[PDB]
């Protein structure tokens, strides 16, 4: 570099130590300054980072290069220039430098490798080197590189490349050791998977230098390697088979000796159970894997209270958990995991090998864990569990009432979790044993802890019980809570009304004998902390749901004054009990909500248009970002962003609260409409950076115009703005799941607007929406290995009722726009998928009932007709409503496929009359009534097909048949096919129906509804002339 350059740099590098003046001055006299200059910037920055005695000078150069080096970027660098760095780079790297400089030197090499910059062999013969020398320094640095830069591991020599990671593995210094792992981790995750079995075969030696950790006592670095472990677990975990169980016993070994440090305990714990959620069958096929599971994780969840026998801390603590309890809280989180991605075929078995021995212990904390595990389990083994009930109740209740606190909290929480898991059954066949059980456990015998848990315990229960189960139960439960009600521990008294409400909510009108003592007890507290008035709120109002309107009158004006005062006092936890609350009024009150809706409305507003809170960030600028619960960090395109995830979580559910605001209101909502539409749905469906938002604003649409319909030019403005924002989404939208929502957004759209609310320039967009839709569908679908192990279906679903929608609406004038993608249509149709051949069937049926399409008969017929007789009952229903619709609607021209299609029908009608193809074979019963009606001895198979019950469009078409073969002794055959369609609301018959038996004695008349029980002939009664 020339002489001056070198001082005025020198100068501005060393400024960056410091002060934020002199420090800014000298960050903005670089950015400023320093296109013409970043080739002298370069060459400068790395000659410090390698030849500064300086440091700190070094380090801050040698960061900085690596920063401004990807932003050049490298490629564009004159070659004459990038030869000079890099050997500077190389230079200092072998010469004399502190560890850490080293590190950042490294990095900064890292930046000047790159596929299409000129070959650095001087590198790789620099790394070879160094990896032999006796410098641990020397060693790590060069994995690290190697970490960065994994593939200059393909450019080394095999028979280098590996002696140098098994002699990583094993190496002397523990930091050289990790890094190699890390290394070696980092080559399966950066390069594509035809790359892998060339270091696949290491996986032995890098398991077998394992235990050497222990043997060292070097636990900590154990945990690092651990950690790496896990990631190559969920890269290539097959890779693990067959030293499968020698990873297993290490594991078990570690978590085992309890005078390690949890670290490595947890980290052995994760990469046991990350196996079951990366390679479910490989663990299943090993009896080993589930028994060293269990086992386990039901030592480590008996650590708990240490030093503390008697539990007194926690007793005294309140009911929030102590996440001191490291070890006990992974132990149960794994359980679950496990549990869930196995299911109870595979564990209840070894589960209870160990659970009937604990649940006896004369270890309080043994009792304990079995009562967390089975709690944990739960969910996962449902499948089994399910059918052992009762053995569960009798291992768990004996324990309800054991000399230990914790271990009756324990009980709690199992008959808690249960109820939630194996719901609705454990409410129909359990509550004699459960609500006696827990509700015990509310009495001031027992300690506070306890008796909120069991309190909690009941809301699990009530959630699924039917208000006639509960009834008996209810004045013992309420005379119980009400205790708890007035306990001294704020969070005794907060559960007590959330486990009140609850109830009450289940009771309904079965509640309504005990408002009246309640509700002033309720408003007492309130007039007296926010959470307790919060949960007293949401009490009040889940209780005048409960019992109705009148009866919630008799306190609501006070109920809302108090509301008021709480909404504009001086917790954000609050202003959820608050909101949900008013909305819970509304509800009560119909429309006579409206006055309030000037203090509601507006706070939901301006939560609602909360804008897309970004931070365009810099890399490190992330880690930090990320410490915040309330944030998280992305990469769009590499350039990464920081997102406040909170506040567009709370933007969705505020725009939840303006969507059924809207929903119950209806035209009463009008007055908003404009704003909300304007302002906050069409807006939303532009927040590329968070989905909710986007499908929250979708899901707006059509409910905000439906609410200015009703009211009332401006609905037509805003309509074809709003459909214009969702035809335009469907092309850009990436995420198949929203995709999918916009369809049916449009779909409701379309039934508001009514007739012909679409402009033809819209409706070609539409199509290229719905074929790029279309296109994207199936080449995720011809997707389906060495190493590993319903949103397609129901956006299709929702294709189909568009453009049903459309064609509806359009009155068949976008059948034009249909011949377009006619060709997806077709290759659909005869694809192997039957979801795509389903999709094409519907749509084909949807075309035929708008004789113009002749066009094509010749070229799906013969597909049709094969679908007929398909094993897949789901193709037989499309294919023969296709048959019906043509009879229906294109009756000449169809007439040669229909009549000989005739027999087969009267084949796929005969497992038919089950559940899952009851749905089938009533639309070919349809499709042969239709035919018979376009157009004997079919007729009476026809009626051996009634009745229809299930499918609404089929049943409504076969009893108008039934009816016209009428007007025009299977009298008790005929009526029952009736009273069957309407008891089982399915689909005027009723009057042919009449005229047949006035044509009968009164006693023959009388014996046909001799059949019927007591609840279905008071309807009969009531649908008869």
């Known amino acids: 570099l020339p002489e001056e350059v070198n001082r005025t740099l020198l100068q501005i590098v060393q400024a960056f130590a410091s002060d934020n003046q002199i420090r800014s001055v000298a960050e903005k006299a670089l950015s400023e300054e320093w296109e013409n200059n ?62 850490s400089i080293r590190h950042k030197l490294s990095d900064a090499i890292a930046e000047c490798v790159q596929d299409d910059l000129p070959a650095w062999p001087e590198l790789l013969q620099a790394l070879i080197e160094s990896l032999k020398s006796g410098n641990p320094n020397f060693r790590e640095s060069s994995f690290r590189i190697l970490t960065t830069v994994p593939y200059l591991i393909t450019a080394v020599d095999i028979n280098s490349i590996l002696p140098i990671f098994q002699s990583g593995f094993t190496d002397a210094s523990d930091n050289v050791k990790i890094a190699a792992v890390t290394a070696f981790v980092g080559y399966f995750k950066q390069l594509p998977k035809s790359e892998w079995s060339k270091l696949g075969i290491l996986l032995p030696s890098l398991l077998n230098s394992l235990p050497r950790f222990l043997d060292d006592g070097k636990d900590d670095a154990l945990a690092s390697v651990f950690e790496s472990l896990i990631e190559l677990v969920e890269l290539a975990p097959k890779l693990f088979k067959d030293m499968f169980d020698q990873i297993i016993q290490f594991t078990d070994m570690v978590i085992k000796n309890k005078d390690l440090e949890p670290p490595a305990r947890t980290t052995a714990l994760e990469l046991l159970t990350v196996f079951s959620e990366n390679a479910p069958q490989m663990c299943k096929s090993n009896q080993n894997y589930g028994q060293t599971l269990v086992m386990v994780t039901l030592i480590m969840m008996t650590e708990v209270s240490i030093d503390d026998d008697d539990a007194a801390e926690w007793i005294e603590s309140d009911d929030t958990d102590d996440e001191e309890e490291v070890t ?30 604990m649940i006896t212990s004369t270890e309080w904390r043994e009792r304990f864990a079995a009562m967390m595990a089975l709690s944990s389990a739960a969910k996962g083994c449902a499948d089994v569990l399910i059918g052992e009930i009762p053995k569960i109740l009798d291992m768990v209740i004996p324990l309800i009432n054991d000399p230990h606190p914790r271990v009756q909290y324990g009980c709690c929480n199992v008959l808690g979790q249960i109820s939630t898991k194996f719901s609705p059954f454990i409410q129909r066949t359990a509550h004699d044993r459960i609500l006696p059980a827990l509700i015990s456990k509310l009495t001031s015998e027992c300690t506070s802890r306890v008796q909120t848990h069991a309190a909690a315990a009941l809301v699990n229960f009530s959630e699924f019980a039917s208000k006639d ?82 009866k919630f009158h008799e306190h609501s004006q006070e109920l809302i004054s108090i509301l008021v005062a709480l909404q504009n006092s001086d917790d954000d936890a609050l202003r959820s009990y608050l909101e949900q609350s008013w909305s819970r009024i509304c509800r009560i009150l119909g429309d006579d909500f409206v006055p309030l809706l000037p203090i509601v409305i507006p706070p939901l507003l301006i939560t609602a248009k909360a804008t897309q809170d970004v931070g365009l960030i810099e890399e490190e600028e992330a880690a930090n970002f990320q410490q915040y619960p309330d944030w998280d960090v992305v990469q769009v395109q590499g350039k990464h962003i920081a997102i406040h995830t909170s506040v567009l979580d709370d933007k969705v559910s505020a725009m939840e609260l303006l969507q059924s605001y809207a929903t119950l209101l209806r035209g009463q909502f009008a007055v908003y409409v404009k704003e909300v539409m304007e302002e906050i749905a069409l807006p939303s469906l532009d927040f590329y950076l968070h989905d909710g938002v986007r499908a929250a604003g979708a899901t707006l649409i059509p409910i905000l115009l439906s609410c200015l319909l009703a009211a009332t030019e401006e609905l037509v403005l805003l309509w074809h703005k709003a459909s214009s924002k969702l035809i335009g989404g469907l092309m850009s939208e990436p995420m198949p799941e929203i995709t999918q929502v916009y369809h049916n957004s449009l779909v409701n759209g379309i039934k508001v607007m009514g007739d012909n609310c679409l402009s033809e320039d819209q409706l070609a967009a539409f199509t290229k929406g719905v074929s790029a839709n279309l296109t994207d569908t199936y080449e995720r679908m011809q997707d389906r290995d060495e190493y590993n192990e319903f949103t397609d279906e129901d956006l299709l679903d929702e294709i189909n009722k568009s453009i049903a929608a459309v064609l509806k609406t359009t009155n068949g004038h976008y059948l034009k726009n249909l011949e377009n993608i006619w060709p997806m249509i077709n290759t659909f149709l005869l694809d192997n998928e039957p979801i795509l051949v389903i999709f094409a069937l519907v749509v084909i049926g949807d075309l035929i009932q708008y004789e113009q399409t002749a066009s094509m008969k010749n070229a799906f017929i013969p597909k049709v007709t094969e679908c007929l007789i398909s094993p897949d009952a789901r193709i037989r229903q499309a294919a023969s409503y296709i048959i019906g619709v043509c009879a229906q609607y294109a009756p000449s021209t169809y007439a040669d496929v229909c009549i000989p299609t005739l027999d087969t029908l009267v084949q796929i009608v005969d497992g038919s009359k089950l559940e899952e193809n009851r749905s089938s074979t009533e639309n070919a019963s349809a499709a042969i009534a239709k035919i018979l009606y376009a157009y004997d001895t079919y007729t009476a198979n026809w009626f051996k097909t009634l009745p229809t019950i299930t499918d609404k469009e089929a049943a409504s078409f076969n009893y108008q048949f039934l009816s016209q073969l009428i007007e025009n002794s299977n009298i008790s055959a005929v009526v029952d096919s009736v009273i069957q369609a309407l008891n089982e609301r399915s689909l005027t018959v009723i009057s042919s129906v009449k005229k047949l038996l006035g044509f009968l004695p009164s006693s023959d008349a009388m014996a046909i509804f001799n059949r019927y029980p007591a609840d279905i002939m008071e309807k009969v009664h009531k649908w008869f002339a």
Not at 45 to 52: G, I, K, P
Not at 352 to 357: G, H
């Open 328 to 357: 006990y809280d992974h132990a149960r989180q794994a359980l679950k995991r496990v549990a869930l991605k196995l299911g109870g075929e595979y564990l209840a078995a070894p589960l209870f090998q160990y659970l009937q021995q």
């Open 469 to 550: 189960i509960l009834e008996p139960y209810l004045d013992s439960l309420l005379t119980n809570l009400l205790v708890l009600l007035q306990s001294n521990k704020l969070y005794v008294q907060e559960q007590a009304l959330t486990t009140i409400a609850f109830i009450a909510e289940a009771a309904k009108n079965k509640f309504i004998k005990y408002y009246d003592t309640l509700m002033p007890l309720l408003l007492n507290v309130l007039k007296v902390n926010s959470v307790l008035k919060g949960k007293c709120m949401e009490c009040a109002t889940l209780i005048g749901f409960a019992v109705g309107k009148e």
């Open 38 to 99: 970043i080739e002298y910037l370069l060459t400068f920055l790395a000659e410090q980072a390698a030849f500064s005695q300086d440091t700190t000078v070094a380090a801050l150069s040698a960061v900085l290069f690596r920063k401004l080096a990807l932003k050049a970027p490298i490629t564009h660098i004159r070659k004459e220039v990038l030869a000079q760095i890099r050997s500077s780079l190389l230079k200092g790297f072998l010469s004399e430098r502190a560890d």
